[PDB]
Design a protein around this ligand. Structure first.
Ligand SMILES: Nc1ccc(CN2C(=O)c3cccc4cc(S(=O)(=O)[O-])cc(c34)C2=O)cc1
Length: 358
């Protein structure tokens, strides 16, 4: 019943191999997508190291520049790029063809990522720094890394909106398992919490009855106890709010997917939906308020190794290993019909409609 409609809209936006990208460079170490505005790829043509920038507003005309850099990350909002070559970091203004800032670290930066329109996060072996692209300021140490992450491949770093709750995520191979290790740091309390987790995100959510938004932390894991998803409030609740009751639900893997696990998460605050992507290319949607599982399907034949929020649709956009750029968002006309008649969850249908009416 109602097989003709889904609660989502799947889209393919590009195929990177048709834009002259070599498939060997379509991967985590060489292809970055810091937001839905740009894809940046490092490639070596002959002996010449190049950066290719694909503007997602005009993708058919990608720009190549010779640049020697071990990593290249575009700003989420503006035509600004950060480049690193060993311990030396530079940020450039593309439009004005000019250096903005530079810094030389004393420790190697194993992982970095833009966390806002103006700030880069730097992860060394022993600490995490935030670096403004503005003014003269050097990077500022935010916290020391927790021992639980020693030896991990760092795969993500993100923060809540107010940059008071900071989350570093790595993974390690423990025999034939991929074990997630997160470090949640409170800026205000100066406290770290180690957490076994594979993918996470923050979100603001205004509870019925509350005048102020709650800051939520959502993470997913597949550990020895199976797949789990948790949704918890972090930090002091605004004065006058009731606290958000913590949610803990299962994350389903079919029997043929014993080695699948979560790899990416983005949240729609417009729809209060969590998007989780798995290693095997499955997407799951969960209600942010309750953790109820709305939808699961395999949407990609290849692993999706990078994701961002998809702004215009409040969805999730990603790149897979073959170079498909794909996205998933709420289908706003069909989601409530699906919840009503396929999930048979009228409580959720009502909550969604109450929010939509505003
Ligand atoms: N297509 C494109 C890409 C990057 C830029 C920004 N940009 C620049 O605009 C730029 C201007 C002048 C010298 C530069 C040197 C270097 S590097 O030698 O340190 O890798 C990098 C840059 C640069 C640089 O990235 C402008 C246009």
């Amino acid at each position: 019943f109602m097989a003709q409609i889904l609660p989502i809209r799947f889209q393919e936006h590009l195929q990177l191999q048709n834009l002259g990208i070599n498939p060997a460079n379509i991967g985590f170490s060489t292809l970055t997508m810091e937001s839905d505005k740009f894809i940046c790829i490092r490639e070596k043509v002959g002996e010449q190291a190049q950066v290719v920038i694909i503007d997602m507003n005009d993708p058919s005309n990608p720009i190549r520049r010779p640049i020697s850099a071990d990593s290249a990350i575009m700003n989420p909002a503006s035509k600004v790029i950060a480049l690193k070559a060993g311990k030396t970091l530079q940020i450039f203004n593309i439009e004005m063809k000019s250096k903005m800032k530079a810094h030389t670290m004393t420790d190697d930066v194993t992982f970095w990522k833009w966390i806002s329109l103006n700030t880069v996060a730097l992860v060394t072996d022993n600490a995490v720094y935030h670096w403004s692209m503005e003014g003269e300021s050097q990077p500022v140490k935010m916290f020391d890394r927790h021992s639980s992450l020693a030896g991990c491949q760092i795969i993500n770093y993100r923060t809540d909106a107010k940059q008071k709750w900071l989350l570093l995520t790595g993974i390690s191979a423990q025999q034939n398992r991929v074990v997630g290790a997160m470090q949640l740091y409170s800026v205000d309390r100066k406290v770290s919490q180690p957490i076994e987790g594979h993918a996470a995100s923050f979100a603001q959510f205004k509870m019925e009855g509350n005048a102020e938004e709650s800051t939520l932390f959502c993470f997913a894991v597949r550990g020895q106890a199976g797949g789990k998803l948790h949704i918890i409030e972090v930090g002091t609740p605004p004065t006058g709010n009731q606290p958000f009751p913590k949610k803990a639900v299962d994350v389903f893997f079919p029997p043929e997917a014993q080695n699948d696990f979560p790899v990416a998460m983005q949240i729609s605050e417009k729809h209060d939906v969590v998007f989780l992507i798995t290693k095997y290319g499955y997407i799951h949607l969960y209600d942010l308020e309750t953790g109820t599982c709305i939808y699961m399907n395999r949407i990609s034949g290849e692993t999706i190794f990078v994701t961002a929020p998809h702004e215009a649709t409040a969805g999730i956009i990603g790149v897979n290993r073959k170079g498909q750029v794909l996205s998933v968002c709420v289908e706003e006309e069909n989601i409530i019909p699906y919840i009503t008649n396929v999930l048979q969850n009228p409580d959720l249908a009502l909550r969604m409609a109450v929010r939509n009416n505003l």
